[PDB]
Amino acid sequence: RTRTAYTRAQLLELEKEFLFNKYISRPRRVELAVMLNLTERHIKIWFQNRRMKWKKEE
DNA sequence: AGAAACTCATTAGAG
DNA sequence: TCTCTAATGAGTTTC
């Protein structure tokens, strides 16, 4: 692949969903993919990297 | 069984 | 140059 560049609007939403959910269920993933217009792959990857970053933060 | 989604560890694209 | 983080690979869970 290349390298997606999330807009500031898209990150704001992904971080909100992250505070409420560290693991996202598929219903919510598709709901967020449709809403922000990203693929389910992008969201699934973002959460995987977001969690690895969260455990290393502290 | 097979497909999807995890973790770890790493590579490499861009502010 | 330096730092953050998207994407991929090997190997493991989960249903």
From Swiss-Prot:
Q: Where's it mainly located?
A: nucleus
GO annotation, cellular component aspect: cytosol; nucleus
Positions carrying Phosphothreonine are T4
Compartments where located: Nucleus; Cytoplasm, Cytosol
Membrane-crossing residue ranges in chain numbering: none
Protein task: Activates insulin and somatostatin gene transcription. Key regulator of islet peptide hormone expression but also responsible for the development of the pancreas, most probably by determining maturation and differentiation of common pancreatic precursor cells in the developing gut. As part of a PDX1:PBX1b:MEIS2b complex in pancreatic acinar cells is involved in the transcriptional activation of the ELA1 enhancer; the complex binds to the enhancer B element and cooperates with the transcription factor 1 complex (PTF1) bound to the enhancer A element. Binds the DNA sequence 5'-CC[CT]TAATGGG-3'.
This chain belongs to the protein called Pancreas/duodenum homeobox protein 1
The organism's taxonomy opens as: Eukaryota, Metazoa, Chordata, Craniata, Vertebrata
